[PDB]
């Protein structure tokens, strides 16, 4: 793998999606920009269990963007607190969680319909990543735009402990073009997004296992 | 519980050749298990792409989207056995119906 | 070193009560969650039962749901899979397998096994 002509990123233990989420052990890759992404077979995650029902398209899109360029946008989420600490996903000496998502639960044991809205003012497309926290008793989620309703229903049900946390953080993606206005509604446990990732128009991704070296 | 399928029940290959194993189920936690005929199975893989203790690096797991795969870059006589793909998301753990590697 | 032995298998008429015992040695029995796995002659494996960690929970499989009563006594380090209402689909070897982490942290990963006891049901 040559370095001089094209920008490579490698990654000890980060799958491209894990760097996208900002897993605590892969947090060093924030805001990184690349031309080609390269993936170790050692890749593993230490946070909450998770699953992207459209893994392939998300991988291709993020790789083609060639940038994370995250920017916190200060969504309202005023009704309840946006931080959440899990026994897994340890980062440091205490509990932690993804660095690009929220684990809302609901303060005062009540979850009002949040009805969050965020206008996409910029001239370039934006991508917002959110999830649904399948527990292990009530709640429905919907991410609405001018083109789709990414309806999701929390698939409640018991499950096997995977990292001492019997649940899932199923992750979806949402494009929000200029002029369109993201709309979000909820009734229960929602993995509230923290901010968009920019998209930039010939980068790609290759799953090579060659060593790392400095050469042309 | 998911209905986990696997590659054809028997794949015949000569030692040293490259092999691939499929476990299309329709993303994570699909540990594989190795059993030698007349022996209690043993762990080979503990996640879609991570190897357990002692396994040679020749075995490599990849794939995602309920379309996982296990590619063997070079077979060895000890590799000709039965391989079952597990799954941990949801309570009922459903091993695949299994497949056999035979010395061609 | 840790080792597992299955016992109590054999021949029993359908519907008769049966109880395997899987003892353990080389480790404190509360250190792991126990399991049971089966395979009929010539078929693929299948799941049977489970105790999560320290015996406050149990979760069986579909085809055998409700029939069995897996239980343990932490003061003697002994496992048992109490069996009721055996049926002709239950001809297979029964392994008692452990997992690769303590107290329950990755449940669903097995590294240690016994030899496997044979249980046969027929006239």
CA neighbor of A184 nearest in space, from A197, A199, A194: A194
Q: Are C37 and C85 in contact (CB under 8 A)?
A: no
Query: In chain A, which ranges are E strands?
Result: 36-38, 70-72, 86-91, 94-96, 117-119, 126-132, 141-144, 171-176, 181-186, 190-191, 195-198, 204-206
Residues 6+ positions from A89 with CB-CB distance below 8 Å: A23, A24, A46, A47, A48, A95, A96, A97, A98, A163
Q: Are A65 and A200 in contact (CB under 8 A)?
A: yes
Given the structure tokens 């519907």, which residue do they identify? Answer: C15
Q: Do C114 and B40 touch (CB under 8 A)?
A: yes
Kind and range of the H or E run holding A59: helix A55-65
Six-digit token pair at B9? Answer: 């029940």
Q: Percent helix, strand and coil across chain C, each rounded to 5?
A: 0, 40, 60
- Domain range for B33: 10-103
User: Cβ of A49: how many Cβ atoms within 10 Å?
Assistant: 24
CA distance C2 to C51: 18
Report the alpha-carbon distance of residue A186 to residue A141 in Å, rounded: 5
Angle at A29 between CA A23 and CA A33, to 5 degrees: 135
CB contacts of B47 in chain A (<8 Å) are: 44
Residues A104 and A94: their CA atoms lie apart, in Å, by 19
Q: Is residue B56 part of a domain?
A: yes
Residue C25: other Cβ atoms inside 10 A: 11
| Structure tokens belonging to residue C47 | 């799941």
DSSP state of A67: B
Number of structural domains chain B divides into: 1
Contact yes or no for A197/A126 (Cβ under 8 A): yes
Select from C63, C70, C71, C57 the least CA-distant residue to C92.
C63
The kind and range of the H/E element at B83 are: strand B82-85
Q: Is residue B50 situated within a structural domain?
A: yes
What are the CA-CA distances from residue B45 to residues A60, B34, B102 (Å)? 26, 9, 21
Pairing mode of beta strands B99-103, B10-13: parallel
In a domain, B3, yes or no: no
Q: How far apart are CA A113 and CA A138, in angstroms?
A: 13
Spatial separation of the C-alpha atoms in residues A174 and A129, rounded to whole Å: 6
DSSP tag of A55: H
User: In angstroms, what is the resolution?
Assistant: 3.8
Record: contact A162-C59, CB cut-off 8 A? no
Nearest by CB: B60 against A41, A50, A52: A41
Is C68 an 8 Å CB contact of chain B? Answer: no
Q: How many CA atoms lie within 13 A of C48 on its CB side?
A: 25
Classify residue B4: in a domain, yes or no.
Answer: no
In a domain, B87, yes or no: yes
Tracing tokens 């309920």 back to the chain, one arrives at B66
DSSP-derived 3-state class of residue A202: coil
Which domains occur in chain A, in start order?
16-206 (3.90.209.20)
Token duo for residue A23: 């897993």
Q: C-alpha distances in angstroms, C99 versus A166, B29, B63, B94?
A: 17, 14, 24, 16
Cα gap A100→A98, rounded to integer Å = 6
Domains and CATH numbers, chain C: 3-114 (2.60.40.10)
- Tokens found for residue A122: 């910029």
- Residue B64, in any domain of the structure: yes
Shortest alpha-carbon distance between residue C99 and chain B (Å): 10
Here the CATH number for the domain that contains residue B89 is: 2.60.40.10
**Distance (Å, whole) CA A178 – CA A173:** 16
Token pair, residue A11, equals 């990654």
- Say if B36 falls within a structural domain: yes
Does the beta carbon of B28 lie under 8 angstroms from any beta carbon of chain C? Answer: no
Q: Is B41 helix (H, G, I), strand (E, B) or coil?
A: coil
Q: From the candidates B2, B34, B83, B92, which should be mutated to test the interface with C, based on the most C CB atoms within 10 A?
A: B92
CB contact under 8 A, A56 and B93: no
* Whole-angstrom distance, CA of residue C108 vs CA of residue A1: 37
Quick check: A145 and A183 in contact, CB under 8 A? yes
Residues pairing with C119 in the sheet: C10, C92
In 3-state terms, what secondary structure has residue B77?
Answer: helix
Per the listing, tokens 């309570």 go with B91
């Amino acid at each position: 793998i040559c370095d001089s002509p094209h920008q490579i990123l490698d990654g000890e233990n980060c799958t491209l999606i894990d760097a996208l989420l900002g897993d605590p052990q892969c947090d060093g890759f924030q805001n990184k920009k690349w031309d080609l992404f390269v993936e170790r077979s050692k890749a593993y995650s230490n946070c909450y269990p998770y699953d992207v029902p459209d893994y392939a398209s998300l991988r291709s899109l993020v790789a083609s963007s060639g940038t994370l360029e995250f920017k916190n946008e200060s969504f309202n989420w005023t009704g309840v607190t946006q931080n959440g600490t899990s026994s897994a996903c340890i980062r440091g000496s205490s509990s932690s969680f993804f660095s690009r998502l929220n684990w809302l639960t609901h303060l005062n044991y009540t979850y009002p319909a949040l009805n969050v809205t965020m206008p996409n003012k910029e001239q370039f497309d934006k991508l917002y990543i959110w999830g649904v926290h399948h527990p292990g008793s009530s709640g429905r989620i919907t991410v609405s735009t001018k083109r789709s309703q990414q309806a999701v229903i929390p698939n409640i049900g018991s499950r096997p402990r995977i990292r001492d946390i019997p649940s899932r953080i199923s992750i979806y993606w949402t494009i929000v073009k200029p002029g369109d206005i993201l709309l979000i509604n909820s009734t229960g446990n929602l993995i509230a997004p923290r901010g968009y990732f920019k998209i930039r128009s010939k980068s790609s991704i290759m799953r090579s296992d060659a060593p790392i070296g400095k050469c042309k | 519980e998911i209905v986990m399928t696997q590659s054809p029940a028997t794949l015949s290959l000569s030692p040293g050749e490259r092999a691939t194993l499929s476990c299309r189920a329709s993303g994570f936690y699909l540990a594989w298990y190795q059993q030698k005929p007349g022996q209690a199975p043993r762990l080979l893989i503990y996640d879609t792409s991570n190897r357990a203790t002692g396994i040679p690096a020749r075995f490599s797991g990849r794939g995602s989207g309920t379309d996982f795969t296990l590619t063997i870059n070079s077979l060895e006589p000890e590799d000709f056995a039965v391989y079952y793909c597990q799954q941990r998301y949801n309570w009922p753990i459903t091993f695949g119906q299994g497949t056999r590697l035979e010395i061609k | 070193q840790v080792q597992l032995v299955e016992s109590g298998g054999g021949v029993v008429q359908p519907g008769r009560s049966l109880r395997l015992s899987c003892a353990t040695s080389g480790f404190t029995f509360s250190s792991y969650g126990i399991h049971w796995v089966r395979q009929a002659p010539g078929k693929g494996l299948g799941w049977v039962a489970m105790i999560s960690f320290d015996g406050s929970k149990t979760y069986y499989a579909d085809s055998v749901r409700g029939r069995f009563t897996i239980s343990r006594d932490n003061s003697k380090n002994t496992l048992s899979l109490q069996m009721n209402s055996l049926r002709t689909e239950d001809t297979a070897v029964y392994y008692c397998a452990k997992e690769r982490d303590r107290d329950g942290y990755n449940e669903g990963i097995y590294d240690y096994w016994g030899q496997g006891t044979l249980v046969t049901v027929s006239s």
